[PDB]
Ligand binder design. Structure first.
Ligand code: NA
Length: 377
């Protein structure tokens, strides 16, 4: 029991941080209504934002797609142009070329910018290497992803060894067609890419994916969260499209000054668009350009909180539905923001890229890193 010799420094590191966090919250209490601050000051006991080397395993009641089939689909149709430039434009992939019988594989196969495409870039993280498994699902069908051997994730300083996510295609999705391509990245924090895009934009459509997740400790036991913060970011809203989260467990917490809020049980840019500065009330342009504050929509943007919020969750099993839907499916045209020269009725691609991790976008959120050491017996 050399524990009694190490316990002294362990308890101090804990108590130090613990006290350091308490003081930080009391300090944030007067800045909670300032831009980028969580309206409800709170610490993040869930460290979950970096897992580039995690292992991925999938099962599905749908169909696995051969990696070669995914590669061919990328080289054809609407993604062809970008393909020739050595770019994997996921939001342009025509799902049509993944619906043939000869595309189905018996097991999971990874694809991405790494094989003979190590140099290539993708729309998920430019040149950084990225890998994903692919399935073809119909409404109600799903894929269950098991992420193992993580190395940077912790809950209350307790190491997270495994995460099991179940992705289900919401039957109420209105996209035309019966199929959806799901690309699940090996790095659980990158999330997934869901698409029913068959080459043409669609009106009054949507694509919603239900997300059920359980995090496990080093003993393989589900982790019973106690107000952990889940990041709901990149909730884009253009004049004709709204990305939102709904049907979720836990409580929504707003980030002061963010365009994201909660209305009628849905989390999205409730009162303005957030695509282009000056358009539809948007404060900043989502993509990087000449104007200050632009490019807010990235994981590292200092003002990414503009299109983000958070959910305080507890319990061993949690869930949230994320998707993109035509603005018309959410409210009457006469109640929408007006952008001269743009038709709020325009169809959109029924696809989406999203993730659910612990990288809360609010500013100065104190992190819990030290676990409370238990007195040796
Ligand atoms: Na987004």
């Amino acid at each position: 029991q050399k524990d009694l010799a190490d316990y002294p420094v362990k308890l101090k590191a804990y108590e130090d941080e613990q006290a350091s966090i308490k003081a930080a919250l009391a300090e944030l209490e007067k800045h909670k209504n300032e831009d980028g601050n969580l309206t409800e000051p709170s610490a993040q006991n869930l460290v979950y934002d970096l897992e580039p080397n995690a292992n991925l395993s999938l099962t599905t009641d749908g169909k696995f797609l051969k990696a070669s089939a995914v590669d061919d689909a990328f080289s054809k149709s609407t993604s062809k142009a970008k393909y020739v430039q050595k770019i994997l434009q996921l939001d342009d992939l025509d799902i049509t070329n993944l619906e043939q019988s000869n595309d189905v594989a018996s097991s999971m196969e990874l694809y991405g910018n790494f094989g003979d495409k190590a140099g290539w870039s993708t729309t998920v993280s430019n040149n950084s290497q990225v890998k994903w498994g692919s399935v073809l699902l119909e409404r109600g069908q799903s894929a269950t992803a098991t992420y193992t051997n993580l190395q940077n994730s912790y809950y209350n300083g307790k190491k997270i060894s495994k995460i099991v996510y179940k992705y289900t295609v919401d039957p109420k999705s209105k996209f035309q067609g019966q199929k959806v391509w799901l690309g699940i990245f090996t790095d659980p924090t990158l999330g997934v890419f869901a698409s029913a895009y068959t080459g043409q934009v669609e009106k009054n459509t949507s694509i919603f994916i239900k997300n059920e997740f359980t995090f496990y400790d080093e003993d393989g036991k589900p982790i019973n969260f106690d107000n952990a913060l889940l990041s709901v970011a990149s909730l884009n809203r253009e004049h004709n499209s709204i990305e939102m989260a709904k049907d979720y467990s836990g409580k929504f917490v707003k980030i002061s000054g963010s365009s994201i809020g909660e209305k009628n049980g849905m989390i999205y840019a409730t009162d303005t668009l957030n695509f282009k500065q000056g358009e539809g009330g948007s404060r900043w342009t989502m993509y990087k350009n000449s104007q200050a504050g632009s490019g807010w929509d990235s994981s590292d943007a200092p003002n990414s909180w503009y299109g983000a919020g958070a959910i305080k969750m507890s319990g061993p099993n949690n869930h949230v539905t994320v998707g993109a839907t035509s603005a018309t499916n959410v409210m009457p045209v006469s109640d929408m923001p007006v952008v001269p020269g743009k038709d709020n009725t325009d169809g959109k691609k029924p696809n989406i890229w999203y993730s659910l991790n612990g990288k809360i976008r609010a500013v100065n959120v104190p992190k819990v890193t030290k676990e409370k050491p238990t007195p040796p017996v």
